[PDB]
Amino acid sequence: QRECISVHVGQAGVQIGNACWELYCLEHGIQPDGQMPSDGDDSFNTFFSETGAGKHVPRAVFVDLEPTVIDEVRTGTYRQLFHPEQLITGKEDAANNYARGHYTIGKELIDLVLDRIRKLADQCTGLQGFLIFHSFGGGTGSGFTSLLMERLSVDYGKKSKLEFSIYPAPQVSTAVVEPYNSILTTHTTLEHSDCAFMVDNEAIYDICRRNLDIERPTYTNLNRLISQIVSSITASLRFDGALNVDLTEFQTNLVPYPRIHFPLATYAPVISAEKAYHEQLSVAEITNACFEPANQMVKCDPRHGKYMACCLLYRGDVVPKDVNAAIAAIKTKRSIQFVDWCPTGFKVGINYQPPTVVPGDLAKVQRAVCMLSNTTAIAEAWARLDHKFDLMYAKRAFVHWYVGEGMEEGEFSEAREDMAALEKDYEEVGMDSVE
Amino acid sequence: QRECISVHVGQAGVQIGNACWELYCLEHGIQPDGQMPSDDDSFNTFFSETGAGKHVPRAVFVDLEPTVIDEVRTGTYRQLFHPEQLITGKEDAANNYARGHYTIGKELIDLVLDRIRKLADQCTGLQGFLIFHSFGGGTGSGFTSLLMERLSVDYGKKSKLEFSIYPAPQVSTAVVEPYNSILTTHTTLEHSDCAFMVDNEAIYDICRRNLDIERPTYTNLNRLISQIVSSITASLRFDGALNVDLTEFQTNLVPYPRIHFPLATYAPVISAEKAYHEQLSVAEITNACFEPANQMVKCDPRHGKYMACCLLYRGDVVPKDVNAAIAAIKTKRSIQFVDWCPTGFKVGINYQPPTVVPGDLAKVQRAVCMLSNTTAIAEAWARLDHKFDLMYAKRAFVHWYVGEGMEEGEFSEAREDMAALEKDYEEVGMDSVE
Amino acid sequence: MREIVHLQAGQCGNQIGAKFWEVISDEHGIDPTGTYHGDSDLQLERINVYYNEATGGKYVPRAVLVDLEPGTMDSVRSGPFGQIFRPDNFVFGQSGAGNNWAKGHYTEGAELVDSVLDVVRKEAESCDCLQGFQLTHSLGGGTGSGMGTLLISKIREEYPDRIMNTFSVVPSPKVSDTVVEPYNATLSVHQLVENTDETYCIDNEALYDICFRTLKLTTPTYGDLNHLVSATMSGVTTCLRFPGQLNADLRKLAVNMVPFPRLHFFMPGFAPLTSRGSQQYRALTVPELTQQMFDAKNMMAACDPRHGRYLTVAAVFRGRMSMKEVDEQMLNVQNKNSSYFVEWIPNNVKTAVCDIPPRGLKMSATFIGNSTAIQELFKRISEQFTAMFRRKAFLHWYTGEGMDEMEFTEAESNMNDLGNPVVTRGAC
Amino acid sequence: SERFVFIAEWYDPNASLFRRYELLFYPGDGSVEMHDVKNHRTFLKRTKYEDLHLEDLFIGNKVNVFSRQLVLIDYGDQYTARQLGSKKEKTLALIKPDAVSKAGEIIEIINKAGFTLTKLKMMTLSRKEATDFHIDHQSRPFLNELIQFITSGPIIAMEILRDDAICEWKKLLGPANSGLARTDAPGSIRAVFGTDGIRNAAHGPDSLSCAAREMELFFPSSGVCGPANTAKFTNCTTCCIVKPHAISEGLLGKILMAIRDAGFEISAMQMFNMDRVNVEEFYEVYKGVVSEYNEMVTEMYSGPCVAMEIQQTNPTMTFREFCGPADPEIARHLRPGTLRAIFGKTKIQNAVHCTDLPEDGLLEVQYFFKILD
Amino acid sequence: FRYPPAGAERVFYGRANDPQIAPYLTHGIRSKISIPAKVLINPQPITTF
Ligand SMILES: Nc1nc2c(ncn2[C@@H]2O[C@H](COP(=O)(O)OP(=O)(O)OP(=O)(O)O)[C@@H](O)[C@H]2O)c(=O)[nH]1
Ligand SMILES: Nc1nc2c(ncn2[C@@H]2O[C@H](COP(=O)(O)OP(=O)(O)OP(=O)(O)O)[C@@H](O)[C@H]2O)c(=O)[nH]1
Ligand SMILES: Nc1nc2c(ncn2[C@@H]2O[C@H](COP(=O)(O)OP(=O)(O)O)[C@@H](O)[C@H]2O)c(=O)[nH]1
């Protein structure tokens, strides 16, 4: 009755969604073959459908332009959980071109992917929306994402569209064409994404170093925390809670203006198993931990900005009015700030289901939060990737691949003034009231 | 009480027949050596009853040339067919309408009408004829045309349905399919009451995509057509909620006496290790017959108007989830009807789930065949019309026909009949302005 | 002493009549083997209304079961209450119905009429004082349209002083189970207007509306769809079979519900309808029952009674109840909404209360309403026919079997000539 | 799929020829189909029917469907002949003259395994019949002991069926010697209710060849053997019926439990297959009296039933008070301790039928234990 | 998977060694039947005194 289709696109998307569906399978019932072995009823019908006897299969489509990373899923443990053409493979990678991911080899895949979205949506009673999972990095994660959202805005315009984005790092990064691809696809996902939640890699690196007590983390451990974030955010419509929230609540409480739709995610208890029992992990302590500017998952300091709206999702054994003491303690601090036009800047939801731990790095705790803070501090990362783009674009570097592949030259400029307008409106809403 | 004859003309007709028999024997619990095993009326629509416990079929396997009736007479189905039903010619028709019709048609046409008469003798109500043939070779074109002429002469009041194997729009199997197809449709327009159209390339694509087999053969192609005609003859075979007859199909599928070419599509074509993850629900199996990939002639239904649509629902089908599915269908703007037929659907519910032959199809609860007459079949007509023009523009292969009883005027007459055909399909496809 | 001759024309009418005979054999205590096992001696007082006696006390229905294809007769025979009927009354025919009014009225149907009237006349003559005929059929499709309306015409010609009841199934707006529902239904109504006395219109979407919103079921079957009609059919003719105060037979219902002779199109209704989840919480009384009838969701035709003025309303209650409850409750309905009742007919409601309820139940009520809102059900078919007839489509069968463009236009003209007074009397 | 075929007759109350039909039960979902043998047509198409069970399907059994009551006479085809063919085995089990006090326990332990029960007699064996019974051990030094035990008290003779019922009933028997059964302790009927190897609880045939002669000696084909140990004239006598319902679900040993734990003295048992005209005579005083006499009639002859004579003891409370009212739902609240209070349900399918009027007592006792074998 | 030899399925290489529980069962959903056909609910069975 309350379902949402997940579209995992790009290689970053398919690994983070593999972590997602691993955590969802270690949640309610479902053995990785796909069968629930009997030993809350409707709880599967948000993320899993239900065939004869029982073969609960995900409402997920796995799209990329290259094989072997879908083929790892099709040869892995969860090869029987999924349906063999929910996982769709191309035969030629987009290879770090927004132009290739969007403009030449997209027509071999966009029709079939739209058709499977249509079949999944017909296999749905009441749809909340589409949770897509990708990066601002490679061509499959950028161009096919842009084309997919260009079609889905026309076809399913009223439905919710939430993006989970692997933003390129401020300082490390894994390639060189992140400025080109990220800015080119943000120019197109600005007017189509109803809300786009963002997460960076170096921030989770720092979190796993300083709190998980692991010095050499791998991307499976990186995406496990993203799986925890998503299983926390889209959790109150799985179960029953003291304060029920859904995706429409998240939009209407996180997005103040139609262009300002980029919140920041932050987890709490990221604590590390042989640390979980020397603290009590109280509600106030985990609240202060998630407002600490050292556990943010996008590398931008929140004190370089003003909070505009924050939502807390307390999952687990949380009495819903120690939350009130924590909020009253936070709103009297002098290191945190809010805009002068938003007196009520907190949206809170509480769910009774404690976080389920997988065999891995995190600790089994009874309380956790999901933080969504819509701050102006994201503009710092936006502007520094703009600076990288200007140093890229000074004397025509790397643009010959894009123009000889098929995108027109002026789109590179148009993305730049689109992101310039996205710079401008942040300080336009961040200036204090004077009239 | 309710019996229909099947006449298998030509190589393609015999292979469609072989698939049909391979399905129907296990459908009615008939062993290959036709007999019930050791352990009430459903047989007496398409099988007649013989002494001891034998069930002999209602068919005429006519072919102008050997080997094709001979795999049947040598293989696993010897003891079922009557050797007098199995009729062979003596020499090949050789892709020649003039040889299917004019010169070697007369040594076999009297015998085949005598055999059709002797089968129809033990038949109290003859519900219809089912002609299984192709628009290709000389047998399947010319002998079907001549047989349809004589059958319209001597059984004119009975319904006569055809299941034609159309030439491929892009590949094609010989070089004279356009000639043979135009010549046979000029003569079979005026007599055949309803001709279901099935080509090969749409089956090739559907078996590659929604059945996940890359290299199966003509047997696996004709198996799906056997499923289609099994869904055609279903309500006079078993008992259901809405028993729909062949006369029922005729009286609601051809709104004008000249437009009589419906396209038939099948749903659940899913491939066994392809169905743990679907529900096979009524709404989605209805949507499968409407999507432009299960359509079984290579034409775009979006490039046309749906005129009438006979849905045959079969299996565990609650009879008014289909109300819900059709109400959902009538709101989609991609499947767009004409303005002069609001009531565009005919439902037929059958209570017997499909039985799967050892092969490739999944064994599922539900099955629908769609029987849609579209204005988009003129688009399929147009390519073969263009090929006919390109070959006749300087008399390609014409001497082989005209030295064999053919007259030069019937080519121009058939081209003018084709002109009348797409004129008919355009001015019935146009909307109301008056 | 009164008798009613039952007829089933068409497949739809045949299963509806089969469920009818099951329901009333349950109410009168008749086993499938023909004998009697029951609990009340009041059930045998008027068993010679629907059942003719035979040797050994084996009561057989006074029903004639006709169709143009022998695939519904064996289904009715192989029903649970199958071999209660007279096997000579199984008037079948080895042919094809072809869902064609032309082939039901001027072809094999009209060839089988001369044989089915023989057993109709025999069942009429084997009675002391016959009152009415009832015919179960469907407009949408053949047989029940063609042969059904021709049966109405011939029986009206032979017996012109007797009541003709017809329980008729009309096509829905949501779907169409064939493609020639307007073509069949217009020629059906053109005969049904200047002939029969009580048309009771039933619609399949209204049946699903009842079975989903009121009865709360998720997979309703044709047993359910015909069962609601069977309950209505048993409750219309129940003051004639079971005793009580303020009895009302079919001709009294006709004279109190038909102001003008053409205006005899009614929409039935049955309203002790409780879901399984709401049966325990129900508060079954006459103040509940009247409100459930006049709620515009339980009306068994897809017409909205709030879109037109009620001309006449008749209610046949069954059970031990008070006429204080009945009379004053129906009066408070008439005063609660007066703009939805006509003023040229004051006190326009009829009350008939039986003592004996249906078995298992205590207080039932059948609703019959002559209202304006039949105009929607008729105009819809009229524009469907204009759309399908402006382009001459689906017509060569009719012109080949013997129909004419002029009489097709006559049927459409008569449909418009009945669409006129329903607006005239609703707008005074 | 997976259908079961049987051949049956039905006697029509009109024209007297036995209507010959073809019954078809579907165990996948409970559904009935019937075909006609005389004219090859259909009859009651495949329809759901939640009152026919699998245990009712047996040869010679008496099955009711849609008040058109059937009796089975053939095994359908070879398929269900294999499925329920060499399965069923007829066996003759004997309660000894000892453990007649605990007869209900033994009837109950036959009832546990699924051993369906077809004939039941309580007889004091005659002098001449003993030497016919002792063929198994003739002319060995045990005739005096076995004669003195067997022709001492009333025995209870039993016809039993299940698959390979011979060896399954030997498995209930355990060791033949009751002392050996006690020393082994395998949980056998002698291990729970025996005394010794000449008076144990039960012993009968060892094979089907011996079962044939045991059957012929104890249940004859025209009938002379059991002297019907009833003591018809015993003044304080009452005849009651464990109904064909309670027999069909299987309650006989538990009824014997409930009635012997009140001190009432069971003096005679017999199972007789009711026919209509004979049911009219036992229920002769009911037509006109009870307004639903027909359901009582059809419940009585809708299957086999055991008549039994009960001897009045246990002062103040008579059998009419031990059984209480007629309807079990009267008895469930009013006098909530009777055997008709809680051993049976509905009103149609009650547990027992009492003698109602006092005088009307020796009459019933005679009907099912004198003027009917 | 790579060269389909005949009319048999193109079975995936990471799927071929799994146990073939695939073919021999019924795929779809049985209709959810609901409460019986109005004889138990519209007039209900019987109430006794
Ligand atoms: N969590 C997680 N993130 C990844 C993984 N691989 C790549 N990423 C992120 O994704 C970015 C590049 O990966 P993608 O953009 O998804 O690669 P792609 O879109 O398939 O582009 P191509 O290299 O053309 O195939 C990097 O900056 C990483 O931050 C992974 O395995 N797990
Ligand atoms: N389903 C099916 N169709 C076939 C088969 N063989 C041929 N066809 C189709 O039938 C057409 C030719 O069949 P026919 O009309 O019978 O040809 P013919 O007159 O017998 O002459 P030849 O086939 O060359 O011997 C081809 O174009 C094919 O498309 C078959 O085995 N199965
Ligand atoms: N109430 C009810 N309606 C039915 C039943 N069966 C069919 N119908 C309706 O009858 C219509 C078609 O009947 P029709 O084709 O005229 O039967 P025919 O007269 O024998 O040709 C369909 O639209 C169904 O909605 C049934 O069992 N009960």
From TrEMBL, chain A:
Pfam families, per database record: Tubulin, Tubulin_C
Subcellular location, record wording: Cytoplasm, Cytoskeleton
Keyword annotations: Cytoplasm, Cytoskeleton, GTP-binding, Hydrolase, Isopeptide bond, Microtubule, Nucleotide-binding
One GO CC annotation: cytoplasm
Domain Tubulin/FtsZ 2-layer sandwich: 243-387
Catalysed transformations (reactions): GTP + H2O = GDP + phosphate + H(+)
Span of domain Tubulin/FtsZ GTPase: 44-241
Listed GO biological process terms: microtubule cytoskeleton organization; mitotic cell cycle
SUPFAM superfamilies, sorted: Tubulin C-terminal domain-like (SSF55307), Tubulin nucleotide-binding domain-like (SSF52490)
A GO term, aspect molecular function: GTP binding
Keyword DNA damage recorded: no
Annotated InterPro entries: Alpha_tubulin, Tub_FtsZ_C, Tubulin, Tubulin/FtsZ-like_C, Tubulin/FtsZ_2-layer-sand-dom, Tubulin/FtsZ_GTPase_sf, Tubulin_C, Tubulin_CS
Major subcellular location class: cytoplasm
Cofactor(s) needed: Mg(2+)
Similarity annotation: Belongs to the tubulin family.
Subunit structure: Dimer of alpha and beta chains. A typical microtubule is a hollow water-filled tube with an outer diameter of 25 nm and an inner diameter of 15 nM. Alpha-beta heterodimers associate head-to-tail to form protofilaments running lengthwise along the microtubule wall with the beta-tubulin subunit facing the microtubule plus end conferring a structural polarity. Microtubules usually have 13 protofilaments but different protofilament numbers can be found in some organisms and specialized cells.
Protein name: Tubulin alpha chain
Organism annotation: Sus scrofa (Pig)
Name of the gene: LOC100158003
TrEMBL record, chain C:
Family membership: Belongs to the tubulin family.
The protein's name: Tubulin beta chain
Subcellular location: Cytoplasm, Cytoskeleton
Function: Tubulin is the major constituent of microtubules, a cylinder consisting of laterally associated linear protofilaments composed of alpha- and beta-tubulin heterodimers. Microtubules grow by the addition of GTP-tubulin dimers to the microtubule end, where a stabilizing cap forms. Below the cap, tubulin dimers are in GDP-bound state, owing to GTPase activity of alpha-tubulin.
Residues in Tubulin/FtsZ 2-layer sandwich domain copies: 246-383
Top-rank taxon, per record: Eukaryota
Gene3D superfamilies (UniProt xref): Helix hairpin bin, Tubulin/FtsZ, C-terminal domain, Tubulin/FtsZ, GTPase domain
SUPFAM superfamilies in alphabetical order: Tubulin C-terminal domain-like (SSF55307), Tubulin nucleotide-binding domain-like (SSF52490)
Gene source species: Sus scrofa
GO annotation, biological process: microtubule-based process
UniProtKB/TrEMBL annotation, chain D:
InterPro entries, sorted: DM10_dom (IPR006602), DM10_NDK7 (IPR057579), NDK-like_dom (IPR034907), NDK-like_dom_sf (IPR036850), NDPK7 (IPR011410), NDPk7A (IPR035525), NDPk7B (IPR037993), Nucleoside_diP_kinase (IPR001564)
Keywords: ATP-binding, Cell projection, Cilium, Cytoplasm, Cytoskeleton, Flagellum, Hydrolase, Kinase, Nucleotide-binding, Nucleus, Transferase
Gene Ontology BP term (one): regulation of microtubule nucleation
GO MF annotations in UniProt: 3'-5'-DNA exonuclease activity; ATP binding; nucleoside diphosphate kinase activity; protein kinase activity
The organism's place on the tree of life at top rank: Eukaryota
PROSITE patterns: DM10, NDPK_LIKE
TM region(s), chain numbering: none
Compartments (UniProt record): Cytoplasm, Cytoskeleton, Flagellum axoneme; Cytoplasm, Cytoskeleton, Microtubule organizing center, Centrosome; Cytoplasm, Cytoskeleton, Spindle; Nucleus
A Pfam match: NDK
GO cellular component: axonemal A tubule inner sheath; centrosome; ciliary basal body; cytosol; extracellular region; gamma-tubulin ring complex; nucleoplasm; plasma membrane
Domain DM10: 1-88
Annotated signal sequence range: none
Catalytic residues, chain numbering: 203 (pros-phosphohistidine intermediate)
Assembly and binders: Component of sperm flagellar doublet microtubules. Component of the gamma-tubulin ring complex.
Family to which the UniProt record says this protein belongs: Belongs to the NDK family.
Name the record gives this protein: Nucleoside diphosphate kinase homolog 7
Source organism: Sus scrofa (Pig)
TrEMBL record, chain E:
Subcellular location: Cytoplasm, Cytoskeleton, Flagellum axoneme
Recorded superkingdom: Eukaryota
Name this protein carries in UniProt: EF-hand domain family member B
Organism name: Sus scrofa
